[PDB]
Every structure is written in structure tokens, then in C-alpha cells.
Design a protein around this motif. Structure first.
Motif, PDB file in Angstrom:
ATOM      1  N   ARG A   7       0.821  -1.198   0.000  1.00 25.44           N
ATOM      2  CA  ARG A   7       0.000   0.000   0.000  1.00 25.44           C
ATOM      3  C   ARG A   7       0.867   1.265   0.000  1.00 25.44           C
ATOM      4  N   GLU A   8       2.046   1.157   0.617  1.00 23.79           N
ATOM      5  CA  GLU A   8       2.995   2.271   0.705  1.00 23.79           C
ATOM      6  C   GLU A   8       3.945   2.324  -0.496  1.00 23.79           C
ATOM      7  N   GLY A   9       3.920   1.293  -1.349  1.00 25.48           N
ATOM      8  CA  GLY A   9       4.826   1.254  -2.485  1.00 25.48           C
ATOM      9  C   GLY A   9       6.249   0.927  -2.049  1.00 25.48           C
ATOM     10  N   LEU A  10       6.400   0.589  -0.763  1.00 23.55           N
ATOM     11  CA  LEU A  10       7.683   0.253  -0.177  1.00 23.55           C
ATOM     12  C   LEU A  10       8.023  -1.221  -0.378  1.00 23.55           C
ATOM     13  N   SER A  11       9.267  -1.544  -0.069  1.00 30.07           N
ATOM     14  CA  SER A  11       9.787  -2.909  -0.153  1.00 30.07           C
ATOM     15  C   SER A  11      10.125  -3.412   1.256  1.00 30.07           C
ATOM     16  N   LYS A  12      10.340  -4.723   1.407  1.00 31.49           N
ATOM     17  CA  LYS A  12      10.655  -5.317   2.724  1.00 31.49           C
ATOM     18  C   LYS A  12      11.626  -4.455   3.549  1.00 31.49           C
ATOM     19  N   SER A  13      12.638  -3.872   2.898  1.00 34.22           N
ATOM     20  CA  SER A  13      13.624  -3.039   3.587  1.00 34.22           C
ATOM     21  C   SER A  13      13.131  -1.607   3.747  1.00 34.22           C
ATOM     22  N   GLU A  14      12.740  -0.975   2.639  1.00 30.86           N
ATOM     23  CA  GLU A  14      12.232   0.399   2.683  1.00 30.86           C
ATOM     24  C   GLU A  14      10.954   0.490   3.539  1.00 30.86           C
ATOM     25  N   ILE A  45      10.722  -1.475   6.439  1.00 32.96           N
ATOM     26  CA  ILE A  45      11.318  -1.606   7.716  1.00 32.96           C
ATOM     27  C   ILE A  45      12.158  -0.389   8.124  1.00 32.96           C
ATOM     28  N   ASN A  46      12.766   0.283   7.150  1.00 34.27           N
ATOM     29  CA  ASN A  46      13.544   1.497   7.422  1.00 34.27           C
ATOM     30  C   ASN A  46      12.599   2.575   7.923  1.00 34.27           C
ATOM     31  N   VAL A  47      11.510   2.682   7.185  1.00 29.88           N
ATOM     32  CA  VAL A  47      10.453   3.613   7.415  1.00 29.88           C
ATOM     33  C   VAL A  47       9.848   3.420   8.788  1.00 29.88           C
ATOM     34  N   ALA A  48       9.564   2.172   9.107  1.00 30.11           N
ATOM     35  CA  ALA A  48       8.993   1.828  10.404  1.00 30.11           C
ATOM     36  C   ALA A  48       9.765   2.475  11.533  1.00 30.11           C
ATOM     37  N   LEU A  49      11.084   2.531  11.370  1.00 32.69           N
ATOM     38  CA  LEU A  49      11.934   3.080  12.391  1.00 32.69           C
ATOM     39  C   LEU A  49      11.911   4.606  12.394  1.00 32.69           C
ATOM     40  N   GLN A  50      11.687   5.206  11.219  1.00 34.09           N
ATOM     41  CA  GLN A  50      11.664   6.655  11.096  1.00 34.09           C
ATOM     42  C   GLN A  50      10.333   7.266  11.561  1.00 34.09           C
ATOM     43  N   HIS A  51       9.277   6.449  11.693  1.00 32.34           N
ATOM     44  CA  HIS A  51       7.980   6.962  12.161  1.00 32.34           C
ATOM     45  C   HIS A  51       7.450   6.190  13.380  1.00 32.34           C
ATOM     46  N   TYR A  52       8.321   5.407  14.031  1.00 35.08           N
ATOM     47  CA  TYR A  52       7.948   4.657  15.231  1.00 35.08           C
ATOM     48  C   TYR A  52       7.772   5.643  16.396  1.00 35.08           C
ATOM     49  N   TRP A 107      13.705 -15.092  11.182  1.00 30.41           N
ATOM     50  CA  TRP A 107      14.951 -14.429  10.831  1.00 30.41           C
ATOM     51  C   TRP A 107      14.826 -13.805   9.447  1.00 30.41           C
ATOM     52  N   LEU A 108      14.991 -12.492   9.398  1.00 29.66           N
ATOM     53  CA  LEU A 108      14.877 -11.735   8.153  1.00 29.66           C
ATOM     54  C   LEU A 108      16.069 -10.795   7.960  1.00 29.66           C
ATOM     55  N   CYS A 109      16.610 -10.782   6.739  1.00 26.13           N
ATOM     56  CA  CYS A 109      17.740  -9.907   6.395  1.00 26.13           C
ATOM     57  C   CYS A 109      17.308  -8.939   5.297  1.00 26.13           C
ATOM     58  N   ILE A 110      17.542  -7.640   5.506  1.00 29.22           N
ATOM     59  CA  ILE A 110      17.127  -6.635   4.517  1.00 29.22           C
ATOM     60  C   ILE A 110      18.073  -5.424   4.466  1.00 29.22           C
ATOM     61  N   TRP A 111      17.775  -4.473   3.565  1.00 35.37           N
ATOM     62  CA  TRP A 111      18.635  -3.292   3.362  1.00 35.37           C
ATOM     63  C   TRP A 111      18.143  -2.017   4.067  1.00 35.37           C
ATOM     64  N   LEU A 112      18.793  -1.686   5.188  1.00 36.04           N
ATOM     65  CA  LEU A 112      18.497  -0.475   5.948  1.00 36.04           C
ATOM     66  C   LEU A 112      19.784   0.297   6.131  1.00 36.04           C
ATOM     67  N   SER A 113      19.838   1.526   5.611  1.00 38.42           N
ATOM     68  CA  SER A 113      21.030   2.324   5.736  1.00 38.42           C
ATOM     69  C   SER A 113      21.035   3.038   7.075  1.00 38.42           C
ATOM     70  N   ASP A 114      21.844   4.066   7.169  1.00 36.51           N
ATOM     71  CA  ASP A 114      21.988   4.824   8.411  1.00 36.51           C
ATOM     72  C   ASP A 114      20.667   5.482   8.853  1.00 36.51           C
ATOM     73  N   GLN A 115      20.753   6.386   9.845  1.00 37.75           N
ATOM     74  CA  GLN A 115      19.609   7.113  10.368  1.00 37.75           C
ATOM     75  C   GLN A 115      18.342   6.253  10.440  1.00 37.75           C
ATOM     76  N   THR A 116      18.533   5.005  10.877  1.00 41.73           N
ATOM     77  CA  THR A 116      17.456   4.030  11.033  1.00 41.73           C
ATOM     78  C   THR A 116      18.005   2.687  11.484  1.00 41.73           C
ATOM     79  N   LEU A 117      19.001   2.206  10.762  1.00 43.95           N
ATOM     80  CA  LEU A 117      19.686   0.969  11.113  1.00 43.95           C
ATOM     81  C   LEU A 117      20.451   1.202  12.410  1.00 43.95           C
ATOM     82  N   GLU A 118      20.866   2.457  12.569  1.00 42.76           N
ATOM     83  CA  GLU A 118      21.561   2.939  13.743  1.00 42.76           C
ATOM     84  C   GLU A 118      20.529   3.483  14.723  1.00 42.76           C
ATOM     85  N   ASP A 119      19.516   4.151  14.149  1.00 46.64           N
ATOM     86  CA  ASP A 119      18.414   4.738  14.894  1.00 46.64           C
ATOM     87  C   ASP A 119      17.895   3.772  15.960  1.00 46.64           C
TER      88      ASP A 119
END
Lengths: 38, 38
Positions: free
Chosen positions: A21-28, A30-37, B2-14
Motif C-alpha cells: 500500500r505504501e509502495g515500499l519494499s521489505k527493507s524500505e 522496515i527502514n520507514v517503520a523506524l523513522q515513524h515509530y 529471521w529476516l535480512c534486509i537493506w536499511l542504511s543509516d539514520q534508522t539501522l543505527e536509529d
């Protein structure tokens, strides 16, 4: 970076409805989840 | 799970102040992120 952690069905599934629904991928998803948690 | 994905900085570190400071763990940090992601 490559991150590996403990996220079960309820959460992987989570990353299916959200990412899609967000047009995101498994990583994008999960990255996002952390930026709006919280 | 167990899941492996692509998360860069300002989140993976966040996941430091959101996990440690919160008492959470790398997974319970990331799982949680999905439970309160907006």
C-alpha cells in the motif's frame, strides 16, 4: 547496511500490507517503520 | 523469524535510542517499529 533480527509472521505479514500500500519494499518498509515509530 | 534486509543509516543505527534507551532489543525494536509505524 544488512540487518538480521527476530520478526515473526505477524510482523512480516505487517510488512506486506504496509510496504505494498505504501509502495515500499521489505527493507524500505522496515527502514520507514523506524523513522515513524512512536 | 529471521529476516535480512537493506536499511542504511539514520534508522539501522536509529535502533539504539529506540531499543537500548527503551529497554528493547534489535528485534523487539524493529518489530515494535512496525507496530507503531505511521
Amino acid at each position: 547496511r544488512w540487518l538480521c533480527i527476530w520478526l515473526s509472521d505477524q510482523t512480516l505479514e505487517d510488512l506486506e500490507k504496509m510496504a505494498r500500500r505504501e509502495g515500499l519494499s521489505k527493507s524500505e518498509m522496515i527502514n520507514v517503520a523506524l523513522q515513524h515509530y512512536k
